[PDB]
């Protein structure tokens, strides 16, 4: 019972706890070995949304306890009770139970293929797919970032386009003032070549608008694909999670029957 | 030592002897047509050369105008100034008519002729600030936000103050700002250094110049290592002026008159010795010792130095109760509710995703209530919930730094975040947030697979086209304020008396008090644990209950503060008085209090009060990166920390130089731009003459960015030979010669660069096309230090991981050295200056192990000879120079082995390991750093990144067969075991340094367990004896034997 206990992983240090408690929710729990015996004995760890709560199990006169409620004749004794009830009665701000015993030895899936070698081959399949997925994700994450900056360059260009157009409109305004202030004289020679200036000026304000428009039409084109990348990013993201989470369980059911810590890196 | 390329002199013995230059393109065509819009309404089009100065263009324009109709309606050319729209969409008046066409950043090739209003010309040379920042000042003038406009107005205090301190004993004070003394942390010279000195003395070489002078004059001296610059000057003048015609009295008199007309300068760079410190404390002096060099100083007239300092002359910028007493937060009789309205812009496949909801929580670093989501209502197809969410926390128990963290999610357990955003529940004026809010969200980062992200920045994402989520905060028919300090203090006095009268006891039994329970020096124990070793609830209750005893152990504070229930104003109010006069603590420890786990203003205020007391300009520029980064976790624009950093920056131009670049570096990162531009604006407005220098460095780097951009797109599938001509052609153009020629190196401003040596300039072989550049050192004693200065400019790699790692290395070296154990790291210079753009220090006389092996190794290629590195080294160091070359190599290699293992950098092989001629070994190109490439598997790797292959083992045991078993190797193993152990006693410092980097968008550092590698690698959960074995075990397994 005690070594099995289902939720007892013993010699896992502080890290592989939070790393096995990563991304579950509410009331999830599991028991640890304490780090020093110049410290305590076992550690109950809770989960309270992203925050990991650490509770000390003290073992003295055959008694196991958090504090003085030492009556609780076993490690395995003390836990059960609190899977049924709240910890709030021990200390106020602890209004959660141990309802989620998430520690299920991961024989739930993993295709139950007793092979070990076959289970390891799966491990490789999933781990490649993962990496394939992580790169697609990554490629996309970057396309997104470029496209964000390329949109905002297009926005300021649009602005600079408008600004330019103002300066030019202003310009053929400015002139009309001084231009049709001279048209009064008899000399229509000079007038002709004042019309030329005026007529360069307007077909230019035409060209410029033709160019801003052309760019607004590409801002939408971009804003489109930008939407697309986001769509596809959010579509990879959930797949990258369950692929990733099944790769944690295959790696567990392996190091459950026979460690071989070093052998694994061939399937990764 | 960036001084000498870390070149050791092994004999020397003291005891003997796309939108770049115009919108669309990178490089304007060498000939270009320009529209000149005349104030008479005409447009004349000039054919201009790309590099023509506005002075030339104007002159040509007003000669051409005479040919178009309406001439006499024009004034004199002198009466006018050009304006145009620039690439940031802003009309810019071009005052400096010596600027070149290709350098105005136009957009469209056109200029408008106007007569200048805004008549304060002076004030409008204010584009200078905007140029240095990379965004026009007028962008700020336009920002509606009251916080922003309050920061601009309120920060000026700091500016005026600093400007005061400088102009105090002017000019000496000014000199001291521009050229602060480069100085070690302690005067106590480490035992290994003292000992290159023969019972405490250095030979130094004081140089001097009279007429013209193409003659300079040595005066070799031999003085105690600890004798000040003034003494040293006296001694040179004394030497220089003794004569058979001057008696002894007369000599003493002449020395008095002269002693203080002079100051000491390092020959070859811009480093001076302007204050009383033991000579040994100046970093140059100490470098020279280590390197086996004779210091070369120069005697400089104080006047000719004061001469090169100009008046900084600061100008205050143009931009020069409440709701009738308001209502206190602690009066609102209700729980908290927030109404979630709708999202707009969610991008999702109705096919791939079932449903979406808003996940929310209230947070202070980690969270103060039951977390809670709204129902999965009208999912994907137009997202509308119209729910009040109900949090169980009373409004009076909200702490000053309370945040809301929300995220939009997908959904047997599909739980997946789409986008995320955080809001401060109070604003910069202490106002509880009420009414309606539009929050633009952030995209789920690389790493984070969590559901909520409370580390992320507080505020709306400034991309318009993002998931915008509308929100509604309650209304209590008044604006609500966070209580006064004096109000909180009474509440604490009350709480205290009130405890003193209970009798029952629960968990947080706040009850012996009167004595200590003595074995209850669990407290001194908890105190020593690193910050990453989670605290358990029993301990949390415990530290709380003995809060008053904790004042006895000041450095227990980080842990106390995490034992507080921040959802309890009773508890928080008490903590406030406790902090109010906690003993200040060493800065290596205060700095944790400025990471993302400690957002309270009172706590951070404390931290800064620690730094204000203890942090020295030496140790501040060592941690300047972490300090800048931490600004991201400050809640508001105006905070005590920015005031502190800013006031140092404007008070010490070496700190300010790097403050500028670190900020400027991250200006693209939209999560920090607005904050950092604002900060940069203050700085630039008040730094004084240095602005002109920055503007030059900035002009250079834009030229380098724009040039490499052309190479990287559009000049590949070209041979190096073709690329190189293009390169050289371009640097020959006048605009480039001008931009890139006389300026300070951003890697170390003490290094002038001027006069490019194009023949020594190349594109290195890398696919990112880095530029190897080489500049004449223009100093009058170049010779005496280094004639040529070479740095690498690289465009394409994110330099800041390297940057961090080198900084870690530097800090490791110091810890080892200053504890008297001599391991020689070579943390070369690296500076990120942009988005994936940077400068790497070049190190002369270093070769990849791979090259060493390629140069020596016989005719027909078959197997590589293991002895050749050793051969190569023997050849470079014949004699008894040898024994010390093998010692340097043994030592550096030992250092770069422990640091490597601890940090878990990328695998070391023959071309990321480098050797120097003096036999110094150093790593380059680190890859990732905390075994980041275990984002896949990893699971208890703890890899040995630096494996000593035979090659290295040979060298270490001078040339033995079966090196595993020699004395030298025992010697080595001892340095290793000693260094590992040394760095382990400083683990807190290292963890804290990584913590403060969670900000920076560094994929390798996203969460505190990205950082947890370090605990494994340094065996923090074990006793040190066990750790030694762990370390040996680790080394034993990678080498297959040797370590027992």
């Amino acid at each position: 019972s005690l070594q099995d206990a289902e939720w007892y992983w013993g010699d896992i240090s502080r890290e592989e706890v939070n790393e096995k408690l990563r991304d579950t929710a509410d009331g999830t729990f599991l028991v640890r070995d304490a780090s020093t015996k110049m410290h305590g004995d076992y550690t109950l760890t809770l989960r309270k949304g992203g925050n990991n709560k650490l509770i000390k199990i003290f073992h003295r006169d055959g008694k196991y306890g958090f504090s003085d409620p030492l009556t609780f004749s076993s490690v395995v004794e003390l836990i059960n009770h609190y899977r049924n009830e709240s910890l709030a009665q021990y200390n106020p701000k602890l209004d959660v139970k141990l309802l989620y015993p998430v520690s299920k030895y991961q024989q739930d899936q993993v295709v139950k293929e007793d092979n070990i070698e076959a289970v390891g081959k799966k491990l490789h399949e999933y781990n490649t797919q993962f990496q394939e997925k992580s790169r697609e994700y990554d490629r996309l994450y970057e396309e997104y970032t470029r496209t964000s900056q390329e949109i905002q360059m297009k926005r300021t260009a649009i602005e600079a386009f408008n600004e330019t157009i103002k300066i030019f409109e202003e310009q053929c305004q400015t002139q009309e003032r001084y231009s049709k202030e001279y048209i009064e004289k008899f000399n229509e020679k000079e007038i002709q070549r004042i019309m030329h200036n005026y007529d360069k000026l307007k077909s230019r304000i035409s060209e410029i608008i033709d160019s801003r428009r052309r760019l607004e039409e590409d801002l939408k084109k971009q804003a489109a694909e930008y939407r697309e990348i986001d769509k596809r990013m959010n579509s990879i993201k959930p797949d990258l999670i369950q692929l990733r989470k099944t790769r944690d369980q295959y790696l567990m059911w392996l190091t459950q029957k026979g460690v071989r810590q070093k052998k694994l890196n061939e399937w990764l | 030592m960036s001084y000498y390329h870390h070149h050791h002199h092994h004999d020397y013995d003291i005891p003997t002897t796309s939108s770049g230059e115009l919108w669309g393109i990178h490089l304007m065509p060498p000939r270009i047509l320009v529209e000149c819009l005349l104030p008479n309404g005409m447009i004349v089009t000039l054919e201009c050369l790309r590099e023509a100065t506005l002075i030339t263009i104007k002159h040509e324009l007003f000669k051409e105008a005479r040919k178009y109709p309406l001439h006499q309606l024009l004034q004199d050319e002198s009466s006018y100034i050009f304006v145009s729209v620039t690439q940031e969409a802003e009309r810019e008046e071009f005052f400096d008519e010596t600027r070149r066409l290709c350098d105005l950043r136009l957009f469209q090739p056109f200029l408008k002729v106007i007569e200048p209003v805004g008549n304060r010309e002076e004030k409008i040379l204010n584009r200078e600030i905007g140029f240095a920042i990379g965004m026009p000042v007028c962008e700020f003038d336009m920002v509606k936000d009251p916080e922003v406009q309050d920061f601009r107005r309120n920060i000026l205090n700091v500016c005026k103050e600093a400007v005061d301190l400088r102009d105090l004993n002017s000019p000496h004070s000014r000199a001291m700002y521009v050229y602060p003394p480069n100085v070690e942390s302690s005067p106590e010279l480490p035992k290994h250094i003292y000992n290159k000195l023969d019972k405490g003395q250095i030979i130094v070489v004081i140089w001097v110049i009279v007429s013209p002078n193409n003659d300079k004059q040595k005066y070799t001296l031999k003085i105690n290592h600890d004798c000040v610059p003034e003494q040293v000057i006296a001694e040179a003048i004394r030497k220089k002026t003794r004569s058979m015609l001057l008696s002894s009295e007369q000599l003493k008199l002449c020395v008095l008159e002269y002693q203080g007309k002079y100051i000491l300068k390092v020959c070859g760079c811009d480093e001076y010795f302007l204050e009383k410190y033991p000579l040994s404390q100046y970093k140059y002096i100490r470098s020279c010792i280590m390197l086996g060099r004779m210091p070369n100083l120069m005697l400089m007239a104080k006047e000719s130095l004061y001469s090169q300092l100009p008046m900084d002359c600061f100008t205050m910028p143009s931009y020069s109760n409440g709701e009738t007493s308001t209502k206190s937060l602690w009066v609102i009789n209700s729980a908290l509710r927030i109404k979630i309205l709708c999202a707009t812009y969610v991008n999702v496949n109705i096919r791939d995703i079932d449903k979406i909801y808003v996940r929310t929580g209230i947070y202070h670093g980690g969270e103060p209530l039951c977390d809670n989501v709204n129902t999965q209502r009208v999912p994907c197809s137009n997202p509308r919930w119209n729910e009040w969410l109900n949090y169980d926390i009373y409004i009076p128990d909200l702490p000053r730094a309370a945040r809301l963290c929300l995220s939009i999610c997908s959904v047997k357990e599909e739980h997946c975040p789409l986008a995320w955003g955080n809001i401060n529940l109070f604003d910069y004026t202490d106002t509880l947030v009420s009414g309606k809010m539009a929050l633009n969200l952030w995209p789920v980062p690389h790493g984070l697979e969590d559901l909520l992200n409370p580390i992320g920045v507080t505020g709306s994402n400034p991309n318009k086209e993002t998931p915008c989520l509308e929100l509604e905060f309650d209304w209590f028919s008044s604006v609500v304020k966070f209580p006064d300090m004096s109000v909180i203090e009474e509440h604490a006095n009350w709480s205290v008396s009130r405890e003193a009268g209970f009798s029952y006891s629960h968990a947080g039994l706040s009850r012996d008090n009167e004595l200590r329970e003595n074995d209850k020096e669990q407290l001194k124990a908890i105190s020593t644990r690193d910050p990453l070793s989670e605290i358990t609830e029993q301990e949390k209750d415990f530290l709380w209950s003995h809060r008053h005893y904790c004042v006895t152990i000041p450095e227990i504070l980080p842990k106390l503060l995490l034992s507080v229930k921040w959802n309890s104003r009773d508890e928080v109010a008490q903590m406030y008085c406790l902090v109010k006069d906690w003993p200040p603590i060493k800065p290596e420890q205060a700095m944790e209090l400025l990471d993302c786990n400690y957002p309270d203003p009172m706590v951070r205020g404390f931290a800064v009060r620690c730094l204000e007391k203890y942090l020295t300009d030496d140790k501040l520029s060592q941690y300047l990166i972490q300090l800048v980064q931490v600004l991201k976790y400050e809640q508001y624009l105006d905070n005590l920390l920015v005031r502190f950093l800013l006031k140092k920056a404007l008070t010490n131009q070496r700190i300010g130089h790097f403050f500028f670049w670190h900020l400027k570096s991250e200006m693209h990162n939209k999560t920090v731009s607005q904050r950092f531009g604002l900060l940069l604006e203050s700085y630039c407005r008040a730094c004084g003459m240095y602005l002109k220098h920055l503007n030059r460095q900035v002009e250079a780097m834009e030229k380098l960015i724009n040039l490499t951009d052309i190479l990287k797109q559009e000049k590949k599938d070209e041979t190096q030979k073709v690329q190189m001509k293009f390169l050289v052609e371009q640097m020959r153009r006048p605009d480039f010669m001008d931009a890139l020629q006389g300026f300070l190196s951003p890697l170390n401003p003490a290094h002038q660069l001027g006069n490019l040596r194009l023949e020594e300039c190349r594109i290195m072989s890398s696919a990112k096309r880095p530029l190897w550049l080489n500049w004449e050192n223009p100093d009058i004693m170049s010779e005496l230090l280094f004639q040529n200065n070479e740095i690498i400019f690289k465009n394409g790699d994110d330099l800041r991981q390297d940057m961090l790692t080198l900084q870690i290395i530097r800090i490791m070296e110091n810890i080892w050295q200053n504890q008297g154990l001599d391991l020689r790291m070579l943390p070369y210079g690296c500076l990120s200056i942009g988005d994936c753009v940077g400068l790497i220090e070049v190190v002369r006389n270093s070769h990849t192990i791979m090259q060493i092996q390629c140069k020596g190794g016989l005719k027909g290629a078959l197997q590589f000879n293991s002895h050749t590195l050793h051969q190569w080294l023997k050849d470079k160091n014949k004699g008894e120079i040898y024994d010390a070359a093998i010692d340097l190599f043994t030592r550096s290699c030992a250092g770069y082995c422990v640091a490597t293992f601890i940090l878990g950098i990328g695998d070391r092989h023959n071309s990321n390991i480098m050797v120097k001629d003096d036999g110094q070994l150093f790593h380059i190109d680190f890859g990732h750093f905390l075994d980041h490439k275990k984002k896949k598997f990893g699971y208890k790797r703890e890899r040995v990144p630096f494996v000593l292959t035979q090659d290295f083992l040979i060298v270490i045991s001078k040339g033995a067969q079966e090196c595993t078993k020699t004395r030298e190797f025992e010697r080595f193993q001892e340095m290793c075991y000693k260094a590992y152990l040394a760095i382990r006693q400083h683990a807190n410092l290292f963890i804290n340094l990584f913590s403060m980097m969670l900000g920076s968008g560094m994929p390798e550092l996203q969460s505190f367990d990205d950082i947890a590698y370090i605990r494994k690698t340094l065996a923090l959960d074990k006793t040190e004896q066990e750790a030694l074995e762990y370390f040996m075990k680790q080394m034993n397994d990678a080498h297959h034997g040797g370590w027992t």
Side-chain angles (χ1 to χ4, degrees), chain B residues 198-475:
Chain B
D198 84 294
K199 291 168 174 155
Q201 300 185 31
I202 345 172
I203 290 153
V204 186
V205 174
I206 279 51
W207 288 82
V208 211
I209 283 173
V210 152
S211 53
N213 224 345
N214 317 329
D215 244 320
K216 304 153 186 160
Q217 307 201 333
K218 280 145 125 79
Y219 298 95
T220 24
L221 279 218
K222 176 155 170 177
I223 24 70
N224 304 356
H225 73 77
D226 59 5
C227 100
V228 310
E230 204 207 14
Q231 276 180 278
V232 176
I233 300 145
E235 214 61 47
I237 296 177
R238 177 165 304 124
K239 262 224 179 171
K240 174 191 153 230
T241 72
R242 337 184 75 112
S243 144
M244 53 159 205
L245 278 184
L246 273 194
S247 79
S248 188
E249 162 180 284
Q250 301 294 343
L251 173 272
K252 276 179 164 103
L253 303 178
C254 280
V255 169
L256 267 30
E257 280 297 341
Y258 272 59
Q259 229 169 112
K261 308 212 159 220
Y262 292 83
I263 39 78
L264 282 173
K265 169 184 191 280
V266 190
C267 310
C269 60
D270 255 12
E271 183 181 323
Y272 301 78
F273 274 75
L274 315 174
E275 97 174 296
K276 288 197 189 292
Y277 281 113
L279 254 230
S280 320
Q281 202 161 347
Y282 280 87
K283 290 162 199 291
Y284 179 69
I285 288 322
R286 220 175 265 207
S287 277
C288 289
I289 295 174
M290 291 300 84
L291 292 174
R293 306 260 185 154
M294 225 159 49
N296 290 208
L297 309 178
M298 193 175 61
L299 265 190
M300 174 124 285
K302 269 183 181 131
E303 284 293 287
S304 74
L305 170 64
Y306 299 165
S307 197
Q308 308 169 341
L309 300 179
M311 255 34 73
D312 46 297
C313 48
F314 162 90
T315 322
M316 286 285 195
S318 90
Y319 55 91
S320 85
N321 271 20
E323 187 261 323
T324 83
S325 278
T326 42
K327 161 190 264 180
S328 179
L329 180 91
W330 284 357
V331 158
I332 287 85
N333 201 252
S334 83
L336 175 65
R337 12 171 270 165
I338 300 157
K339 200 185 212 289
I340 305 297
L341 266 51
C342 58
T344 45
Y345 181 82
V346 188
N347 297 136
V348 147
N349 304 317
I350 309 165
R351 316 234 139 179
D352 198 36
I353 288 306
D354 295 12
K355 262 124 260 192
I356 65 116
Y357 63 107
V358 175
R359 171 139 228 124
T360 65
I362 281 77
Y363 285 71
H364 196 258
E367 68 143 15
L369 50 63
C370 258
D371 205 282
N372 94 75
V373 325
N374 50 56
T375 24
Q376 299 172 170
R377 272 151 173 167
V378 190
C380 308
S381 83
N382 231 102
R384 295 142 69 183
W385 325 261
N386 273 276
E387 297 188 45
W388 287 94
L389 298 173
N390 285 307
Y391 309 96
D392 41 18
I393 170 149
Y394 296 134
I395 302 304
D397 289 329
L398 280 185
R400 185 60 180 74
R403 285 151 56 246
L404 165 65
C405 310
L406 38 86
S407 90
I408 311 188
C409 298
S410 305
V411 168
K412 284 156 177 61
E413 299 95 59
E414 291 144 285
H415 295 340
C416 187
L418 303 184
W420 70 266
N422 300 337
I423 283 174
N424 307 323
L425 301 186
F426 297 88
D427 80 22
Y428 79 101
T429 57
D430 313 302
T431 302
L432 182 265
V433 124
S434 63
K436 248 187 220 142
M437 291 276 147
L439 199 64
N440 264 285
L441 312 191
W442 297 89
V444 283
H446 270 327
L448 181 130
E449 289 210 323
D450 265 296
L451 277 161
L452 215 40
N453 202 63
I455 263 183
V457 118
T458 161
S460 80
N461 182 340
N463 199 339
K464 176 187 207 154
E465 288 286 352
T466 14
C468 180
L469 183 79
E470 282 160 59
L471 288 192
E472 214 219 301
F473 299 91
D474 250 315
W475 173 234

Side-chain angles (χ1 to χ4, degrees), chain B residues 635-894:
Chain B
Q635 263 188 325
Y636 308 124
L637 298 183
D638 191 336
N639 64 259
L640 285 172
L641 177 76
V642 228
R643 299 204 170 240
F644 173 82
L645 294 171
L646 183 49
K647 178 167 188 147
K648 297 272 151 193
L650 282 167
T651 254
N652 170 340
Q653 207 191 252
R654 210 206 326 291
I655 281 173
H657 162 103
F658 285 106
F659 181 74
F660 173 82
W661 283 106
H662 298 325
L663 300 160
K664 172 70 164 182
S665 175
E666 294 255 340
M667 277 309 277
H668 57 282
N669 195 339
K670 292 154 215 190
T671 99
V672 302
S673 333
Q674 185 216 49
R675 173 178 237 138
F676 285 6
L678 279 178
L679 181 47
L680 276 178
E681 187 209 21
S682 322
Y683 177 76
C684 283
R685 214 158 262 296
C687 72
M689 275 309 106
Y690 203 51
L691 188 66
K692 266 139 189 158
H693 290 306
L694 286 166
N695 262 338
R696 267 192 297 269
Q697 294 178 33
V698 175
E699 267 141 27
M701 309 308 284
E702 295 323 292
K703 282 230 142 54
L704 292 181
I705 283 138
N706 231 306
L707 176 61
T708 49
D709 282 343
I710 328 151
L711 286 172
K712 299 181 84 196
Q713 352 163 3
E714 285 185 291
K715 300 272 177 306
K716 21 129 214 170
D717 303 63
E718 307 291 326
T719 52
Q720 170 94 6
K721 185 215 162 54
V722 152
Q723 252 155 299
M724 275 284 312
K725 297 189 169 184
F726 170 74
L727 180 73
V728 181
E729 141 174 352
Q730 292 297 320
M731 322 203 75
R732 288 220 189 88
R733 306 223 217 184
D735 51 290
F736 268 84
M737 286 283 94
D738 270 12
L740 266 163
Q741 253 172 352
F743 71 100
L744 308 190
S745 114
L747 278 162
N748 182 335
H751 286 162
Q752 297 185 233
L753 312 166
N755 271 305
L756 249 184
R757 287 184 49 156
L758 299 172
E759 323 285 273
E760 263 302 333
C761 287
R762 36 207 216 297
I763 314 177
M764 297 295 80
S765 57
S766 149
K768 324 262 180 138
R769 314 319 278 141
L771 301 173
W772 182 294
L773 302 165
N774 193 282
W775 279 275
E776 273 157 61
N777 172 190
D779 194 301
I780 351 148
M781 317 279 236
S782 345
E783 289 64 63
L784 253 303
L785 191 55
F786 50 86
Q787 266 192 292
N788 277 3
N789 187 324
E790 21 185 31
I791 91 100
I792 296 159
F793 173 92
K794 202 221 274 163
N795 174 347
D797 271 11
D798 180 347
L799 270 331
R800 59 219 210 266
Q801 297 88 16
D802 272 331
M803 197 159 174
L804 178 63
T805 226
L806 298 165
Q807 190 212 15
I808 300 259
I809 269 166
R810 212 167 295 106
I811 290 146
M812 270 178 182
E813 188 156 51
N814 298 347
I815 286 183
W816 288 331
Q817 202 132 32
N818 297 310
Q819 184 190 46
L821 87 113
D822 172 29
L823 286 145
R824 270 180 257 153
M825 315 301 302
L826 179 21
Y828 58 89
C830 195
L831 174 68
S832 167
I833 55 109
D835 182 6
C836 283
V837 185
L839 302 175
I840 298 93
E841 185 184 343
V842 145
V843 173
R844 300 177 71 95
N845 306 316
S846 43
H847 318 250
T848 56
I849 291 264
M850 178 207 296
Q851 258 162 317
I852 267 108
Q853 283 189 99
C854 287
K855 293 155 150 193
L858 212 44
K859 302 176 212 164
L862 219 27
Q863 250 168 342
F864 264 145
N865 190 10
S866 260
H867 283 83
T868 46
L869 176 74
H870 191 36
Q871 310 308 341
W872 175 90
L873 207 141
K874 280 186 189 153
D875 181 279
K876 292 289 149 137
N877 310 66
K878 287 135 187 162
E880 199 192 292
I881 272 83
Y882 178 92
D883 310 78
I886 299 304
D887 185 58
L888 186 57
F889 186 107
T890 297
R891 286 176 191 281
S892 54
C893 189

